[PDB]
Amino acid sequence: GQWDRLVLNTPSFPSNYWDKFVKRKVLDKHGDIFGRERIAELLGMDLAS
Amino acid sequence: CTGNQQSLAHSRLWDAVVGFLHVFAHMMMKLAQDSSQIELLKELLDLQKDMVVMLLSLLEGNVVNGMIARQMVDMLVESSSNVEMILKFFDMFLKLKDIVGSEAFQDYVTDPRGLISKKDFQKAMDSQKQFTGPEIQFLLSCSEADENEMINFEEFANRFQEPARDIGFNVAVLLTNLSEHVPHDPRLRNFLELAESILEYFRPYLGRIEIMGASRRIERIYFEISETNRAQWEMPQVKESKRQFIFDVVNEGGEAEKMELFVSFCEDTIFEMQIAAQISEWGELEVQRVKFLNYLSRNFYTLKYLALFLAFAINFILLFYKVSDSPPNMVYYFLEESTGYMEPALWCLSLLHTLVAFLIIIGYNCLKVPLVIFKREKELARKLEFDGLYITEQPDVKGQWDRLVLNTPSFPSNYWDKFVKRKVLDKHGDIFGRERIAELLGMDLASLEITAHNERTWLMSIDVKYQIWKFGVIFTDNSFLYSGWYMVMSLLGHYNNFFFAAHLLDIAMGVKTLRTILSSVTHNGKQLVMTVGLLAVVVYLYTVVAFNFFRKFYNKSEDEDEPDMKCDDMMTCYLFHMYVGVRAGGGIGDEIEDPAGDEYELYRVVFDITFFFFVIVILLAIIQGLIIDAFGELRDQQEQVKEDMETKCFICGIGSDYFDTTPHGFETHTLEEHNLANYMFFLMYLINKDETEHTGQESYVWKMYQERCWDFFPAGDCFRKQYEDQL
Amino acid sequence: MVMSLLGHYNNFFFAAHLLDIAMGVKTLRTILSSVTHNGKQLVMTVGLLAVVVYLYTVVAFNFFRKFYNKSEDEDEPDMKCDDMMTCYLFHMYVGVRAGGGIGDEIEDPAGDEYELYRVVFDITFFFFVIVILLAIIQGLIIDAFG
Amino acid sequence: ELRDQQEQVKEDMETKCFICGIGSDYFDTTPHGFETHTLEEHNLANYM
Ligand SMILES: CNC(=O)c1cc(C#N)cc(C)c1NC(=O)c1cc(Cn2nnc(C(F)(F)F)n2)nn1-c1ncccc1Cl
Ligand SMILES: CNC(=O)c1cc(C#N)cc(C)c1NC(=O)c1cc(Cn2nnc(C(F)(F)F)n2)nn1-c1ncccc1Cl
Ligand SMILES: Nc1ncnc2c1ncn2[C@@H]1O[C@H](COP(=O)(O)OP(=O)(O)OP(=O)(O)O)[C@@H](O)[C@H]1O
Ligand SMILES: Nc1ncnc2c1ncn2[C@@H]1O[C@H](COP(=O)(O)OP(=O)(O)OP(=O)(O)O)[C@@H](O)[C@H]1O
Ligand SMILES: Cn1c(=O)c2c(ncn2C)n(C)c1=O
Ligand SMILES: [Ca+2]
Ligand SMILES: [Zn+2]
Ligand SMILES: [Zn+2]
Numbered sequence A: 001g002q003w004d005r006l007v008l009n010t011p012s013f014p015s016n017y018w019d020k021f022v023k024r025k026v027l028d029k030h031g032d033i034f035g036r037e038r039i040a041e042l043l044g045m046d047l048a049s
Numbered sequence B: 001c002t003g004n005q006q007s008l009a010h011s012r013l014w015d016a017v018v019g020f021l022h023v024f025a026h027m028m029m030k031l032a033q034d035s036s037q038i039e040l041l042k043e044l045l046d047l048q049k050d051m052v053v054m055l056l057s058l059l060e061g062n063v064v065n066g067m068i069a070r071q072m073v074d075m076l077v078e079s080s081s082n083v084e085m086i087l088k089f090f091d092m093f094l095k096l097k098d099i100v101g102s103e104a105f106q107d108y109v110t111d112p113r114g115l116i117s118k119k120d121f122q123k124a125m126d127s128q129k130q131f132t133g134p135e136i137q138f139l140l141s142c143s144e145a146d147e148n149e150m151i152n153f154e155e156f157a158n159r160f161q162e163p164a165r166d167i168g169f170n171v172a173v174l175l176t177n178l179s180e181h182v183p184h185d186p187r188l189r190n191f192l193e194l195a196e197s198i199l200e201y202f203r204p205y206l207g208r209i210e211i212m213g214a215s216r217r218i219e220r221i222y223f224e225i226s227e228t229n230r231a232q233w234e235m236p237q238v239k240e241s242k243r244q245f246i247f248d249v250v251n252e253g254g255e256a257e258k259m260e261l262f263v264s265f266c267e268d269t270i271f272e273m274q275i276a277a278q279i280s281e282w283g284e285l286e287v288q289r290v291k292f293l294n295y296l297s298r299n300f301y302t303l304k305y306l307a308l309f310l311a312f313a314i315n316f317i318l319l320f321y322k323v324s325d326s327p328p329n330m331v332y333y334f335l336e337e338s339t340g341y342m343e344p345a346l347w348c349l350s351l352l353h354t355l356v357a358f359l360i361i362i363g364y365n366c367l368k369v370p371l372v373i374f375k376r377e378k379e380l381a382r383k384l385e386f387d388g389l390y391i392t393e394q395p396d397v398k399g400q401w402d403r404l405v406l407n408t409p410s411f412p413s414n415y416w417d418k419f420v421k422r423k424v425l426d427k428h429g430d431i432f433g434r435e436r437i438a439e440l441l442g443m444d445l446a447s448l449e450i451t452a453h454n455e456r457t458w459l460m461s462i463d464v465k466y467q468i469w470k471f472g473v474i475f476t477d478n479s480f481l482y483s484g485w486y487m488v489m490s491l492l493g494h495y496n497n498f499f500f501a502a503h504l505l506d507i508a509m510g511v512k513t514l515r516t517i518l519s520s521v522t523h524n525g526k527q528l529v530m531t532v533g534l535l536a537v538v539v540y541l542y543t544v545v546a547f548n549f550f551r552k553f554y555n556k557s558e559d560e561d562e563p564d565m566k567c568d569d570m571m572t573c574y575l576f577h578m579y580v581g582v583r584a585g586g587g588i589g590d591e592i593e594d595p596a597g598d599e600y601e602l603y604r605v606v607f608d609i610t611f612f613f614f615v616i617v618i619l620l621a622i623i624q625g626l627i628i629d630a631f632g633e634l635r636d637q638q639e640q641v642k643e644d645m646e647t648k649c650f651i652c653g654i655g656s657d658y659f660d661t662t663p664h665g666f667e668t669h670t671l672e673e674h675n676l677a678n679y680m681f682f683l684m685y686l687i688n689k690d691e692t693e694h695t696g697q698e699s700y701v702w703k704m705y706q707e708r709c710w711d712f713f714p715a716g717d718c719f720r721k722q723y724e725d726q727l
Numbered sequence C: 001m002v003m004s005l006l007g008h009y010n011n012f013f014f015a016a017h018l019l020d021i022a023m024g025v026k027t028l029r030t031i032l033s034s035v036t037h038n039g040k041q042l043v044m045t046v047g048l049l050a051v052v053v054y055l056y057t058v059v060a061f062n063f064f065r066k067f068y069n070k071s072e073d074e075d076e077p078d079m080k081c082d083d084m085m086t087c088y089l090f091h092m093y094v095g096v097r098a099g100g101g102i103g104d105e106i107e108d109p110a111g112d113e114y115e116l117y118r119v120v121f122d123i124t125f126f127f128f129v130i131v132i133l134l135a136i137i138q139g140l141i142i143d144a145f146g
Numbered sequence D: 001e002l003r004d005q006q007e008q009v010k011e012d013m014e015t016k017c018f019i020c021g022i023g024s025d026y027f028d029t030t031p032h033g034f035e036t037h038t039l040e041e042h043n044l045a046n047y048m
Helices: A003-007 A022-030 A036-043 B002-007 B013-031 B038-058 B067-078 B080-100 B118-127 B133-142 B153-158 B165-181 B186-194 B196-200 B227-231 B236-250 B257-278 B286-299 B303-318 B342-366 B369-384 B397-405 B420-428 B434-441 B449-455 B465-475 B478-492 B497-510 B513-526 B529-548 B570-581 B601-645 B665-673 B676-687 B696-705 C002-006 C011-024 C027-040 C043-062 C084-095 C115-145 D002-013 D033-041
Strands: B206-213 B217-224 B321-324 B331-334 B555-559 B562-565 C069-073 C076-079
Touching: A022 A036, B013 B038, B013 B067, B013 B080, B038 B165, B067 B080, B067 B165, B067 B186, B080 B133, B080 B153, B080 B165, B080 B186, B080 B196, B118 B133, B165 B186, B165 B196, B165 B206, B165 B217, B186 B196, B206 B665, B206 B676, B206 B696, B217 B676, B217 B696, B227 B676, B236 B257, B236 B601, B257 B369, B257 B676, B286 B342, B303 B342, B303 B497, B331 B342, B342 B369, B342 B478, B342 B497, B369 B397, B369 B420, B369 B465, B397 B465, B420 B434, B465 B478, B478 B497, B497 B513, B497 C043, B513 B601, B513 C043, B529 B570, B529 B601, B570 C115, B601 C115, B676 B696, C002 C011, C011 C027, C027 C115, C043 C084, C043 C115
Parallel strands: none
Antiparallel strands: B206 B217, B321 B331, B555 B562, C069 C076
């Protein structure tokens, strides 16, 4: 897990996977319990707004 | 008793309860709006705690689908709109503590005093999307204004939590009892999701259990588990006893004592949890002695690594002694290639290990001795005052040495029962002379001291024979004897520094596999001593054939005159044969002479080849065989246990089969229904009540425990059968 | 790949590319996996087997030392139990490997001096190191394979 | 093997009736069931 922290902010993280919307999945699922500006900075979603 | 529970099921008692349900949902939500109203509201919660326990005791002796259960649920839905208002009050005042624990609102306050602003904390609850619009003004009205900038979220969290603690657990019991009792009620399915937060805050503190009493029916029994009972259960010093207790019960213990050992193990755990709670963090003196023994016991398992790494360190340095004819008779000096203070380093390392071994010997005497002495004294007291060990029959070296404890006044003084003297006296003082058995027990003022309690520094005290008896029984513990050998050789290590080489063997005595090899050498080696006894007889019958006949052959004549003989004195030749015979690979022939001189040759050649086959290729293999196979079995028994515990209930008598015809069936049967741990916990609850608060089953299991009959354990079912179908 | 390029430094390092034979053909991999899997539980046996030879090498250093000698000829009297760091070694170079335990590589306890004790020192070596321990080890491997 | 046959017997006699044809199963669904079946009902000694 500790080595895989560096992949949470590349834009081509799921790029060798069939699902590409897993960023919006956990954002729209957990963006209300925490600050959705924080978890977007955890994921690096550019132009999230 | 059904005859009351039928009459209560036919009055207007529900219509009494419905009126109590309507006054409860409205009194709180009015009384929650002041600080000067809180004295009254604690009384109200304790009232409805006592109301729902009447509902629970009404719902005992309950069948899975019975009309008492069905009259319970529609009365809850005839009283819907208020019972969610009490449910939402529990639901809102529980997430309030979990929300305020988040840092998003500690960032929303900028006051260093902590006095969070009201509208600031209003938008804080508006930021999270779990509460509602009317909730925050209900919470703002619940808050103190204090110039509209101070709600003090810390005290506001726990103010309405501790008085609401037991009742919020208790209402979750009744909801989860009925939902587990009757299936297919969507109103209950509406209820359970409406009260989800009070379930998960009160699922870890809850415990379930299933006993079978009251004319062949198993039923779910429920209870409270404290934070304190679960805190000192998940300790490794408790857990190490549990892993051993798993082993020696399912391996060599039969199905009969497996409950009797279990409650003994359960009785074993309460003592050591008590003694771990005892040590939990001129005049004077007491303070120093207490603080010292606490720190020593606290280390113990961490202290022992220091002893081992010191024995490695001194021994590695000690692997440099050299002998010379002339000192720089013969002297044993040290090499010291670098660090010419390396001999002073060894000298310091020796002291430190002997003190550390002393600090282990003393710490063992406050995390062992009370457990083994309690275990003997309880076993003796129960097995006496029940079977009559020392009054009806007579003995065993465990019994013969324990005769000296029958007359100390502080015999049960490291046990919870202290009235076991009056127990067996009032039970057996009529069959024999009660003046005699009192003299057997030494009850001073047996005619006088009983009625006085009715109507109304030499080692600190002055103890004697009970300490001598304690010192004998602790000296008899195999693990104390080992640690005493380790201490003994440490001080003997100051006579000659090389004796610290014996402290190296501790490596074999701890690390599992190693202990398995030595236990293999010992266990089957008791049956092996007859093989090496037979192997002596063999070499011996060989050493006579030679003494008599072939002797000219057996000779080590170095040169002419020098003709060392071997088969002249037998006492030697048997020896010779055992010094070169058994060890040579080529049996014996190798160490003698070619049967060139036909004289007997054929016979001589038969004498060797027979040696071979027998001693070197057969016997000397059987021996290896024994050891290897012993090791193998050892490894196999360890295996077994594992499988077994992963293929049976350990509480009821059904494997992972009936409980397997369903997704993660077994687990659910273990982690919720039958958790050996549960059957334990249950007991400290039982133990810590008052006997006047025990329910029906709670007094029923207690009074069967207090005479040690064990028929309340299920042994054949688990609702999955008694009710199998209907569910 | 690494050893292939290292094979251009000295052509003999292509001898290490032969071991690929063991790494593919089922049975072979089973033997090496047996040496590795139970061999994690085995390192404590050879850790125990070190402690054994070591407790033997002190009994000698102190007492029987006159016996341990390889004096080729008169003056030439190579000694073995003078410097311990060596004798533990000696014992591990001829002791564990000789079939006849240790006695084979020293001298007859002719001089009764301690003899009985000397004879007990060897026969105990035998049983322990050569006939018990050195078999347990084999045992581990064989059973793992099994 | 020798050592294993000696084992066997033991188990067997501690897992069957030796008189009727039922192991410690039907006679196991009850506290100390087997024993009672042996020491009172089916005691080889009795049949003697
Ligand atoms: C023998 N048992 C004993 O209780 C014992 C009694 C006395 C006395 N008086 C003194 C010591 C040193 C004891 N020994 C251990 O206490 C012990 C030994 C090992 C195995 N050993 N082999 N290899 C390895 C290692 F090198 F890898 F560390 N360790 N573990 N172990 C261990 N267990 C739990 C906690 C801490 C330890 Cl240190
Ligand atoms: C080790 N595993 C590897 O993947 C491997 C990795 C690298 C790299 N970089 C290089 C090589 C050569 C590798 N080796 C094999 O690839 C291989 C070895 C064997 C067993 N070996 N033993 N005896 C026999 C024989 F002599 F009878 F042929 N073969 N089979 N085998 C095999 N398997 C499937 C397809 C083809 C083969 Cl050649
Ligand atoms: N009533 C039971 N039925 C079946 N198996 C059980 C039962 N109780 C305990 N076990 C088994 O024994 C274990 C319980 O304690 P154990 O120490 O053996 O392992 P663990 O609980 O899973 O891990 P740990 O206790 O170290 O966190 C379970 O993992 C489970 O495999
Ligand atoms: N009908 C039976 N069913 C099951 N087991 C039996 C039966 N009869 C005898 N046994 C077993 O064999 C034993 C009977 O005699 P055995 O000599 O083998 O041991 P023991 O009777 O318990 O001890 P001892 O006879 O020496 O006092 C019982 O212990 C019991 O284990
Ligand atoms: C007070 N007390 C008991 O009452 C008890 C017990 N074990 C069983 N019981 C009943 N222990 C350890 C105990 O301390
Ligand atoms: Ca009562
Ligand atoms: Zn079960
Ligand atoms: Zn039968």
